[PDB]
Write a protein that binds this ligand. Sequence first.
Ligand SMILES: O=C(O)c1ccc[n+]([C@@H]2O[C@H](COP(=O)([O-])O)[C@@H](O)[C@H]2O)c1
Ligand SMILES: O=C(O)c1ccc[n+]([C@@H]2O[C@H](COP(=O)([O-])O)[C@@H](O)[C@H]2O)c1
Ligand SMILES: Cc1ccc(N)cc1C
Ligand SMILES: Cc1ccc(N)cc1C
Lengths: 346, 346
Amino acid sequence: LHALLRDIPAPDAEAMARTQQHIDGLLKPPGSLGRLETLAVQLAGMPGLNGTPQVGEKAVLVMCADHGVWDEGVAVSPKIVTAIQAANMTRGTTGVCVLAAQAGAKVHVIDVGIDAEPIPGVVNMRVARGCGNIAVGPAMSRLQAEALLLEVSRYTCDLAQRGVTLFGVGELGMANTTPAAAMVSVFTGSDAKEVVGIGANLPPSRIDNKVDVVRRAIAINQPNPRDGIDVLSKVGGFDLVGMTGVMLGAARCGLPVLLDGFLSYSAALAACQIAPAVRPYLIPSHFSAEKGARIALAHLSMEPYLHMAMRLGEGSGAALAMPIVEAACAMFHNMGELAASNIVLP
Amino acid sequence: LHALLRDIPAPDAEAMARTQQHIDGLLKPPGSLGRLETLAVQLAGMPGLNGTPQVGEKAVLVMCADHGVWDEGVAVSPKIVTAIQAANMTRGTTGVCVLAAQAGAKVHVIDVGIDAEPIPGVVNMRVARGCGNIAVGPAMSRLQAEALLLEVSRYTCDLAQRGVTLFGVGELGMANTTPAAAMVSVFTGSDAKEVVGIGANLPPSRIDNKVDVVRRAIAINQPNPRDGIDVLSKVGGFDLVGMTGVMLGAARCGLPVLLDGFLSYSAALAACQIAPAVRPYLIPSHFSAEKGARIALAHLSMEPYLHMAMRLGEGSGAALAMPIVEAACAMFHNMGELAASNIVLP
Ligand SMILES: O=C(O)c1ccc[n+]([C@@H]2O[C@H](COP(=O)([O-])O)[C@@H](O)[C@H]2O)c1
Ligand SMILES: O=C(O)c1ccc[n+]([C@@H]2O[C@H](COP(=O)([O-])O)[C@@H](O)[C@H]2O)c1
Ligand SMILES: Cc1ccc(N)cc1C
Ligand SMILES: Cc1ccc(N)cc1C
């Protein structure tokens, strides 16, 4: 794992310079395509993309797991929904499946800790039947977190060998916006009340209890903000750890990763804390309707491309933004050039 | 034309109700897909879509024309760029062509007033070789505006008969952000300084002259804010009139139209002034980096889906948002249902 983190490559400034120069000469006023240009340059700096903005195969990895904190009344969705939905993922009837198919991406459903019998068709990496209830103790041991990080990392960079050049990250787990709020609170130094939201339609009357649970989780575990792994293991969850592992794997692989919503923001804060070198590979997708979204995004210094008021999770936002990444590539490779049309601008 | 405006159908509330009910029963927490759900319902209300959110063929109509106000020094791009770029449109090397191709849409380049010889391959509807310089008089006569509105309207709804169900609108014309600013200023009652931007890289030192030109155009023509056609003919342009005509045509056809950037906002303000019934058919795409964008969008009560800091024009933003419209349709038709998985939520 220390080896892993050590070998994450820095962006290729040489390729980025050649990219910027090429974009400036395209048939349009310089910089007129805004963030599409910036995105093309960022991609060009990713070693795994071979010095140019391109997109081969696309995959969305969905990390599924249950949470012990569900028993504290922080979620109105029945617990079995995780297992049921995970099975529906294998049938392509869920939100991510439909949006991923529309984008030409393949969905990988990974069980990292669902509290139910194993589901056929689902990649099995379960650590346990749900993580511990963060309200009275840690979600898992540091060892378990480090092991899952490593496992998911290898799985991720291994897909790279099969033609995948763009990753989308997502999750599935009833009650997970609670440990995500705790994590955000700890990494950004924000108070619980400012980052706890309604998750999957939590009644406004039950928000107070959710805020109290987050505070207790922090007070009891005393997670160290300067140690992302400590934070993930104490007040995180298997699914959040797995999302973090995808980001580390793609970064080690020198490939881009599309973030999803609020849960993904949490995992990204942890990943950047564990290894700052990961940041250049992260690409925002949409702006989650979850209350603590603005704060988490500010500490990540990211501005999402899509404002859809989405809050489903599953990696649906990630899949929705994949066409945007391909648009920057098409712009870069298919537009004509100013010089060829004899156009000279000041 | 009075007939045209009179026959614009109202949205089908019955189909929208059936749509909302179906969306609520899909495999996800109710409302969790945010604006994607709202978009699906809006589409379902459009009579031309046959009571359901669907997308058949897609077209982006680009209105090209030159402006007499170019001689006032409000644009740094040479005048011939309009003619040159219009020709490049027929070769698929421009920004809209590349993004439209990526979306599976066909681009229609229409000349409504380019100051040059006719360009082969371009639909010919030229009113004249450029419109009058709005700084010293009207851009065109009311008759010419009404005639082009009608012409473009018929062309638009005629494409509907050939399988087109989704339109994107765009333009091409050096100096057009000047008449667009004048229009926005007049319709929203905002001062020139608040809505004039840098257009296609206008030097910050030349902004003052541009603001003065807009004020003079308004003072001399005295356009009536309550008469959209009066406004278009006096301080607008052929290209802006044509964009307005596409919106009226699609609305009469009961079909959706995707707006583009700042120029399209101007045309949409005019269209809504001429016929309020047009509003339900308009769909925002991106948030233009032009200074007066926020004001124009506020008066239209629209919140764009994409924040890309784009300012190219051509209908490139419209094409970039087409995948989003198809995503709402895929969501609606391909996701599974809660009841089928035995999931019961409060
Ligand atoms: O991705 C988001 O921004 C998001 C925001 C709110 C809720 N969710 C989803 O809903 C679940 C978490 O909600 P909850 O109330 O059980 O904490 C989980 O399975 C997520 O996929 C996801
Ligand atoms: O669509 C926008 O928001 C947009 C914003 C700024 C500039 N433009 C494009 O640039 C041209 C207008 O810029 P200008 O400086 O000549 O007024 C015209 O051909 C448009 O297609 C377009
Ligand atoms: C100069 C210029 C201005 C606008 C557009 N759409 C394209 C070009 C090349
Ligand atoms: C209840 C619920 C919660 C989250 C998700 N992704 C899906 C469902 C069905």
